Each structure stands twice: as C-alpha cells, then as structure tokens.
From a paper:
With the aim to accelerate the diagnostics of this key pathogen, we used the flycode technology to generate nanobodies against the conserved and highly abundant outer membrane protein OmpA. With an estimated 100,000 proteins per cell, OmpA is the most abundant OMP of E. coli and occupies around 6–20% of the bacterial surface alone, depending on the cell size. In this study, we refer to these isoforms as OmpA-short and OmpA-long, because their extracellular loop 3 differs in length. To gain insights into the binding geometry of Nb01 and Nb39 and to rationalize their specificity and species coverage, we determined crystal structures of Nb01-OmpA-short and Nb39-OmpA-long, both resolved at a resolution of around 2.3 Å.
The structures revealed that both nanobodies bind to the surface-accessible epitope of OmpA, consistent with their ability to recognize OmpA in the cellular context. Nb01 binds with all its three complementary determining regions (CDRs), whereas Nb39 interacts via CDR1 and CDR3 only. The complex interfaces are 548 Å2 and 658 Å2 for Nb01-OmpA-short and Nb39-OmpA-long, respectively. The crystal structures of Nb01 and Nb39 revealed that they recognize all four extracellular loops of the respective OmpA isoform, thereby explaining their specificity for OmpA-short and OmpA-long, respectively. Intriguingly, in both structures the nanobodies extend the OmpA barrel like a “flame on a candle”, and hence avoid strong steric clashes with the LPS sugars. For example, the most frequent non-detected OmpA variant (OmpA-ND#1), an OmpA-short isoform variant which accounts for 54% of the non-detected strains in the Swiss collection and 46% of the non-detected strains in the 661k dataset, features a NFDG motif in loop 3 instead of the more frequent NVYG motif. As the crystal structure revealed, the entire NVYG motif is recognized by Nb01, thereby explaining why deviations in this core region of the OmpA-nanobody interface are not tolerated. For the E. coli lab strain MC1061, an EC50 of 12.95 ± 3.24 nM was determined. The crystals belonged to the P21 space group and contained two copies of the OmpA-Nb01 complex in the asymmetric unit. Diffraction data were measured at the beamline X06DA (PXIII) of the Swiss Light Source at a temperature of 100 K (Paul Scherrer Institute, Villigen, Switzerland) and processed using autoPROC60 in the space group P21.
Numbering used by the authors:
A (entry chain C): 5 to 121
B (entry chain A): 0 to 171
The structure:
Amino acid sequence: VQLVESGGGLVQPGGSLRLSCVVSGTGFTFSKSPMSWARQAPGKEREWVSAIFADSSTYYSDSVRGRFTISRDNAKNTVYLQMNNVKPEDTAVYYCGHRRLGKTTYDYRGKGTRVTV
Amino acid sequence: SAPKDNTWYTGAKLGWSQYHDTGFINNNGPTHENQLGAGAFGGYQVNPYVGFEMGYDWLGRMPYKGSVENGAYKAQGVQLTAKLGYPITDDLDIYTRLGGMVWRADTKSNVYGKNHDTGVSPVFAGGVEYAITPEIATRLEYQWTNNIGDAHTIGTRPDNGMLSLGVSYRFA
Ligand SMILES: CCCCCCCC
Ligand SMILES: CCCCCCCC
Ligand SMILES: CCCCCCCC
Ligand SMILES: CCCCCCCC
Ligand SMILES: CCCCCCCC
Ligand SMILES: CCCCCCCC
Ligand SMILES: [Ca+2]
C-alpha cells in the first residue's frame, strides 16, 4: 500500500483548501478500505482529524467538525479533505492513513502535505 | 443402541450457538456471540460403533453493535464426519464425531463493507444418543468448529461451539 498526499500550501485565515490522498499498491481493495486523515501541528503530537469508512460514512474530530469535509472517489483511489474557514490552528502537516482488514489502526505511510495558515 | 448395520437415517437439530475469538471491528456496543443454531443431518451406520453422517449447519448471525463502527458476521456450511460410539445402556449411547465442514462466512460492516469467503474447518463433536423407539432417536451433543474465516478476506476467523438437541428417524 502506497499513499501520496497533495494539495497543501499557503492560505489566508478564513480561506479554503482541498487536500488529496492517492492510494496505490497491491493486496488491498480500495472500495473496502477505510481511510483517515491526521495532522501534526508545529510543536504538537499527531492529531487524528477525519475518517471515511467503506460505506462512505464519515467521522471528524471536534476541532474540525463543520469546517472540514472528507470524501472519496473510488474510481481514482483518492481521498479528499476539503478545508474551509481555516484557522491558525490548522497549520500542520497532514497525513492520510489506510486501515487493513484485521487491524483497528490506520497506517500513515505517506510523506504528507503541509498547510500554512 | 445404534442404527442397524448397513441402514440409513435422517435428522435435524436446534442448538445454542456461541462464537469465540470474535475479533473483527472496534465496536463500542454489544457483540452478541450467542445465537440460535440449526442443522439437518443424514447418516449411514456401518456397525454398532461406526457410522458416517452428513449435514448442513446454520451457525447464526453475530451482530457487532456500536455507535461508530458496527457490523455483523454470519456462517453456514456442509459437514462430513465419522461417528464413533459405544453403549452406556441398551438404549443410551455415547459418541464422538470427527471430520470437516466446508463453510461460507459473510461479514457486513460500515468499516469494511460486505465481504465473504469459503474454506474448510475441522469438526469435533461429542454427545449422547437415546433410542426412544426403534425408529426415533434423540441426541444431545456439543459441536466445535475451528477457525471459520480468514483475517485477510473477511477480517475475522472465529470458532464456533454449538450445544444442540436433535432428533433422527431410522429407516432400517
Ligand atoms: C440466544 C439464543 C439461545 C437459544 C438457545 C436454544 C437452544 C435450543
Ligand atoms: C447467554 C444466554 C444463552 C441462553 C442459553 C439457553 C440454554 C439452552
Ligand atoms: C427440516 C429439515 C431441513 C431440510 C429442508 C430443506 C429442503 C431443501
Ligand atoms: C444426507 C441428507 C441429510 C440432510 C441434510 C443435508 C446434508 C448436507
Ligand atoms: C436453516 C435456517 C436458514 C437461515 C438462512 C441461511 C441461508 C442463507
Ligand atoms: C464435550 C464435547 C466434545 C467436543 C469438544 C471439543 C473441544 C472444544
Ligand atoms: Ca481458533
């Protein structure tokens, strides 16, 4: 399983930005794969932020609820994180994780993409 | 006593099915491992101590309840076993059954969606059988079916223990 994040960059407070996570590799079925988004802000530990299941149900941390939107496009093996009304607290490197059958945890295998508010 | 030599019989059973080692998803609600099992079986008796029986088993649907992650597991199969027993009394026999079950297991969850797999599991059973009449026999047994699934295909591989009551008709 290979994960590549993209879309990060400079944004003003209140702005919007969409991140993308493209999943590739072997031994996995993306349509059945639950995915997640986490972030690590400067001087803080990594914080889980969002998750999307195989049934397309979505989940969010309180810190981003109502502002961030996770979505998936199974035709392109891609997960998106649409970020609206960004705060200085949203400045972080964002990582996407892939959860395997048999594990309750997500594997954050990507290099990440940095957002700077 | 056992069915007559070289004679056939048919039967059905109901039971308390209980799954074990049910790790699957991180559901925050109840997991109901206890379910109603059901099966039908037919058999051929070789001698008073040895017989062969074949049957279908419905092992029940196990729900994984929860507010976030939730799902369910289901299993059924066809089995073939050798029945070995000897008498406690002229009408009450004690026996064991040894063999295998070809099973289909299905899982449903929001986390992983719909998945299913097929495979083989060994069957170990022991019980007692009482001859109510020359044609009718009742049985009480515990049946263990090992490793029904696969972590990589459906996310779980539970065991099943079933305590069942059964009735069979002998055509001798
Ligand atoms: C929770 C279901 C148990 C039913 C047991 C019935 C045994 C014949
Ligand atoms: C865990 C409760 C199961 C009910 C058992 C009934 C005995 C036949
Ligand atoms: C009660 C015995 C079960 C078999 C009935 C189903 C026939 C296909
Ligand atoms: C041999 C017929 C017994 C009835 C249940 C079906 C066997 C798989
Ligand atoms: C013997 C009970 C039938 C339950 C449904 C099993 C077939 C999918
Ligand atoms: C007492 C019933 C015999 C089958 C049990 C096998 C070990 C779980
Ligand atoms: Ca086991």
